[PDB]
C-alpha cells in the first residue's frame, strides 16, 4: 500500500536523472530487456531455436550478410536443421536442407508470400503494377508471358544473334580488341556485365533496344543498376541521390520502350523478333484485362535486370573456375572440335544440345556458385513443421537456401571441388524427376526435394533457365574455341562475395587471355 506510493515517487525521480543516466539508460533497458526475452523464448518449445544476439533489432544480420553460410554451417551444428534468428526488425526461420526445400518453396499460397518479402525491394527498381507489386496471380501470368517468348524457335533465333553480340565485344572492346591484340587482362567483372547486357537486349529487347546501349543511354541502365542492392530492405526510399538517378533511369528506361511498343503498333510493326514483339503480342490476362504499354516496359525492366546479374555473375565464375583449370578448357575445346565439324558447322541451339560437357561446367558452376544464397517469404499464417513440435507464427519469414545444400558433402561428394564430371549422363538444365504441376505458366516438376536446386522450385520458379543456358552456352562455346585464360601470378578463386544482390566475386578478379589463333581477325 504505501509502496504504491513509492512506485510513483520513484518514477517521478526517474524522470529527474541527469541527461547522463536518462540516455545510459535509454541504452540498457533495451539492451536487459531482450537478453532476457530471449532466455524466456528458449523455453518456448512450440518455436524453433533463436540463435543468441547481443544488439537488438540490428540482430546477427552482421555475420549473416558477410558469411552466411558458415552461418548457417555453426547454427546446424548447435540447433539442427530448423531455427530462427533475428535480422534488422524480421525474424527468419531457416528450414535447411532438403525438407527445407520442400517445406518452403512448396508452401501453400495461403502459408506464404514472396510478394509480401520482396516488393519493398523490386518495385522501386522496375517499376510498378508488375513482379512484386501485384497479386501472386498476376505475377504467374506474367511469367506465362515471359515464357511464352522463351521456346526453342525462340532460342533458335537468339544463338547467331547472341554469337554475333560476342564477336562484336570481342572485336571492339577496349577489354580484347582481339584484332589488334594476341594477349592482355581483362577482369570478368567489367567485362561479364557487359557481355550479359549486350546480348540479352540483342536478343530479348531487339535490335533497336540494344542500339541504344551504344551511347549515353547505357548510363541509365548503370543508374537504375545501382538501386538494386539489399539497402532497399532498409531504407527503401531514402531522400538520397542515387535514389533519384534510379528512379529518374526507371522513368527513363521505361519510356524507351514504350516509345518503341507504341511506335511498333502504330505502324503494326508486330512479328516475332523479340519479347517486346511478344508481351504485345500477348499480355491479357485470364480475367480480361491487358498490360498497360508502362506494365509491359516495367515487366521488361524487372525480367532484363534480374537475369542479367544472375547471368553476368555466373560467367565471371564460370571463367574464374576455368582460369584455374587448363586441363577442362582443353576438354571443353575438343568438345568445341567434335560437335562443331573443327569450326566450320555453325552454332546453333540444336548443336548447343550435344555439348554435354560445356552444359555441364555452367551446371557444376551454378553448382558451387548459386546466386541466390537465401530466398525469403512471410509467414501469413501459423505454419506447422511436420516431424516436430514447432510453429512458425504469422509475421516471422521462412528462409530456404539450396546454396548451402550444394556446397554439402552430404549430397555432393567433395562439394567444394570444382568437378563437371561428377555430372556425366546428366548435363540437363534441371530435370523433372517425376510428377508435375502447373500455377499458371506451365508444367513444372511438382517435389521439390531436389538437393540441387539452382533455379528453385514451386510457384516461383525461374521461368528463366533455358534462357540463361542459351546465353552461358554461345558465351562459352566462343569463349573456349576463342581464348585460352589464366590467373595472374598469385591468384586464384576469389571468394563469393555474397554481401551484394548475387553471391559475385570479390574484386577485381582477373585472368590473362591469349588468342588461340593470333593472325584471326573478325569480320
Ligand atoms: C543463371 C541464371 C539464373 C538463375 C541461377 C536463376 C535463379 C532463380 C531462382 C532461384 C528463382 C526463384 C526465386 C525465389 O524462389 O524466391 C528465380 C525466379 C525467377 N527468375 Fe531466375 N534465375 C536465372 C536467370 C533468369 C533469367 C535470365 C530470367 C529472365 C529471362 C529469370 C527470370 C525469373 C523469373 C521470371 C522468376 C520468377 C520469380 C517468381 O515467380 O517469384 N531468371 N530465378
Ligand atoms: C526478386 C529477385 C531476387 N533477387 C535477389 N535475391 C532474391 C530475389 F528473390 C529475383 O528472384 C532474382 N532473380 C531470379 N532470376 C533473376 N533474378 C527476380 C525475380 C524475377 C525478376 F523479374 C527479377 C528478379 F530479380
Redesign the pocket.
Same mark, same amino acid.
Given at each position: 500500500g504505501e509502496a504504491l506510493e513509492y512506485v510513483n515517487i520513484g518514477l517521478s525521480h526517474f524522470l529527474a536523472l541527469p541527461l547522463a543516466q536518462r540516455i545510459s539508460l535509454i541504452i540498457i533497458i533495451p539492451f536487459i530487456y531482450n537478453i532476457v526475452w530471449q532466455l524466456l523464448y528458449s523455453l518456448r518449445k512450440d518455436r524453433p531455436p533463436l540463435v543468441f544476439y547481443w544488439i537488438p533489432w540490428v540482430g546477427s544480420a552482421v555475420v549473416y550478410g558477410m558469411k552466411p553460410y558458415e552461418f548457417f554451417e555453426e547454427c546446424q551444428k548447435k540447433y539442427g536443421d530448423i531455427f530462427s534468428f533475428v535480422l534488422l526488425g524480421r525474424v527468419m526461420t531457416v528450414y535447411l536442407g532438403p525438407k527445407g526445400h520442400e517445406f518452403v =518453396?512448396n508452401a501453400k499460397l495461403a502459408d506464404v508470400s #514472396?510478394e509480401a518479402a520482396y516488393a519493398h525491394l523490386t518495385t522501386p527498381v522496375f517499376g510498378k503494377g508488375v513482379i512484386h507489386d501485384c497479386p501472386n496471380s498476376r505475377?504467374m501470368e506474367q511469367?506465362k508471358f515471359?515464357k511464352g517468348a522463351?521456346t526453342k524457335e525462340a532460342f533458335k533465333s537468339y544463338v547467331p544473334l547472341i554469337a554475333e553480340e560476342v564477336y562484336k565485344y570481342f572485336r571492339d572492346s577496349k577489354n580484347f580488341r582481339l584484332n589488334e591484340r594476341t594477349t592482355g587482362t581483362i577482369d570478368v567483372m567489367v567485362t561479364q556485365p557487359e557481355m550479359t547486357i549486350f546480348t540479352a537486349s540483342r536478343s530479348?529487347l531487339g535490335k533497336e533496344m540494344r542500339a541504344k546501349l551504344d551511347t549515353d543511354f547505357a548510363y541509365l541502365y548503370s543508374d537504375l543498376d545501382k538501386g538494386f542492392t539489399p539497402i532497399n530492405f532498409v531504407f527503401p526510399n531514402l531522400p538520397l541521390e542515387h535514389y533519384r538517378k534510379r528512379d529518374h533511369a526507371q522513368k527513363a528506361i521505361s519510356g524507351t520502350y514504350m516509345s518503341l511498343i507504341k511506335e511498333r503498333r502504330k505502324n503494326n510493326d508486330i512479328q516475332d523478333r523479340d519479347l517486346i514483339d511478344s508481351l504485345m503480342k500477348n499480355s491479357t490476362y485470364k480475367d480480361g484485362v491487358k498490360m498497360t504499354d508502362q506494365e509491359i516496359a516495367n515487366l521488361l525492366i524487372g525480367?532484363l535486370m534480374?537475369?542479367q546479374h544472375?547471368?553476368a555473375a555466373?560467367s565471371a565464375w564460370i571463367l574464374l573456375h576455368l582460369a584455374e583449370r587448363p586441363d577442362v578448357q582443353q576438354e571443353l575445346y575438343e568438345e568445341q572440335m567434335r560437335v562443331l565439324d573443327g569450326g566450320k558447322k555453325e552454332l546453333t541451339y540444336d548443336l548447343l544440345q550435344e555439348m554435354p560437357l560445356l552444359n555441364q561446367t555452367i551446371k557444376e558452376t551454378?553448382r558451387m556458385h548459386?546466386?541466390?544464397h537465401s530466398?525469403?517469404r512471410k509467414v501469413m499464417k501459423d505454419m506447422h513443421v511436420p516431424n516436430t513440435s514447432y510453429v512458425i507464427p504469422a509475421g516471422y519469414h521462412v528462409l530456404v537456401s539450396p546454396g548451402y545444400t550444394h556446397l554439402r558433402d552430404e549430397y555432393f561428394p567433395n562439394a567444394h571441388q570444382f568437378n563437371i564430371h561428377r555430372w556425366n549422363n546428366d548435363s540437363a538444365s534441371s530435370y523433372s524427376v517425376g510428377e508435375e504441376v502447373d500455377y499458371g505458366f506451365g508444367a513444372i516438376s511438382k517435389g521439390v526435394s531436389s538437393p540441387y536446386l539452382?533455379?528453385?522450385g514451386?510457384?516461383?520458379?525461374?521461368?528463366?533457365?533455358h =534462357? #540463361?543456358y542459351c546465353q552461358?552456352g554461345v558465351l562459352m562455346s566462343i569463349f573456349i574455341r576463342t581464348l585460352k585464360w589464366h590467373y595472374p601470378e598469385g591468384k586464384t578463386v576469389p571468394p563469393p562475395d555474397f554481401t551484394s544482390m548475387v553471391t559475385l566475386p570479390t574484386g577485381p578478379a582477373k585472368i590473362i587471355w591469349e588468342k588461340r589463333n593470333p593472325e584471326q581477325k573478325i569480320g
Open positions: =518453396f #514472396a505475377l511469367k515471359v522463351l530479348l525480367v534480374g537475369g544472375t547471368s555466373t551454378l548459386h546466386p541466390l530466398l525469403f539452382p533455379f528453385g514451386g510457384r516461383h520458379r525461374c521461368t528463366g533457365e =534462357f #540463361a552461358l
